Design a protein around this ligand. Structure first.
Ligand code: HEC
Ligand code: HEC
Ligand code: NI
Ligand code: NI
Lengths: 106, 106
């Protein structure tokens, strides 16, 4: 899968969490988002095609996925503790990670 | 100034930027936010006072301020180009930084 695929996965599953018909859908969507984020971390975005992999730009791009995965993991822990409403609330705050990275590089 | 006063400065000047309609107003407000963020950047909040300075929690807290300052700087550059509405949109996206740090550390 490529970066566009990964972003579709992130977009669809963030919306699944927002609209989940049952609690179990939340964990399943978070799990798919985590994998999409780690896959996306291994891509080069079109607007950074000219930059070194050691550029401050590519460093900040990769770091955004590490930080997103950390907060996905926090939400997964809540869902695995049965606190699925709290997990859904945490997932809502993941949109800030999307908006931040996009502001830089989308 | 102390942490409470720096946080009030950040709070109020976000609204100043929202209320504004010209570049000078937005620039002045962002410059005050930058100074408040930098004033609060280096201290340890009394909740992490027993944590090591290189501990993961202090590292993430310090990065919160470093990253906030970076995006204030970017918003300032837009204001200095006369791009009032782009600077206002960038300032509104700063709320993600405020909420991220608060949810971790407050
Ligand atoms: C950087 C660390 C990112 C994070 C975190 C998220 N996204 Fe992203 N996204 C990023 C880039 C560089 C791009 C441009 C990709 C391109 O090839 O042009 C995108 C794009 C999207 C898109 C549009 C995809 C397309 O087919 O053009 C969507 C729908 C999208 N991103 C969604 C999305 C969501 C919901 C995120 C949070 C959960 C998210 N992204 C994080 C970089 C980064
Ligand atoms: C960490 C890296 C933070 C960032 C980024 C922002 N804030 Fe914050 N804020 C932080 C702490 C640790 C505290 C509590 C300090 C204490 O001793 O209690 C706060 C508090 C506030 C407050 C309330 C002030 C009070 O006396 O309770 C406000 C109104 C506030 N913060 C606003 C704010 C805004 C608007 C921010 C982004 C622009 C922001 N903070 C960032 C830690 C951190
Ligand atoms: Ni975090
Ligand atoms: Ni950034």
């Amino acid at each position: 899968a490529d970066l566009e695929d990964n972003m579709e996965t992130l977009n669809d599953n963030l919306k699944v969490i927002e609209k989940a018909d049952n609690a179990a859908q939340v964990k399943d969507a978070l799990t798919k988002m985590r994998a999409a984020a780690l896959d996306a971390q291994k891509a080069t975005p079109p607007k950074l095609e000219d930059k070194s992999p050691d550029s401050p730009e590519m460093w900040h791009f990769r770091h955004g996925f590490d930080h997103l995965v950390g907060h996905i993991d926090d939400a997964l822990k809540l869902a695995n503790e049965g606190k699925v409403k709290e997990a859904q609330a945490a997932a809502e705050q993941l949109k800030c990670h999307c908006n931040h990275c996009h502001q830089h590089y989308r």
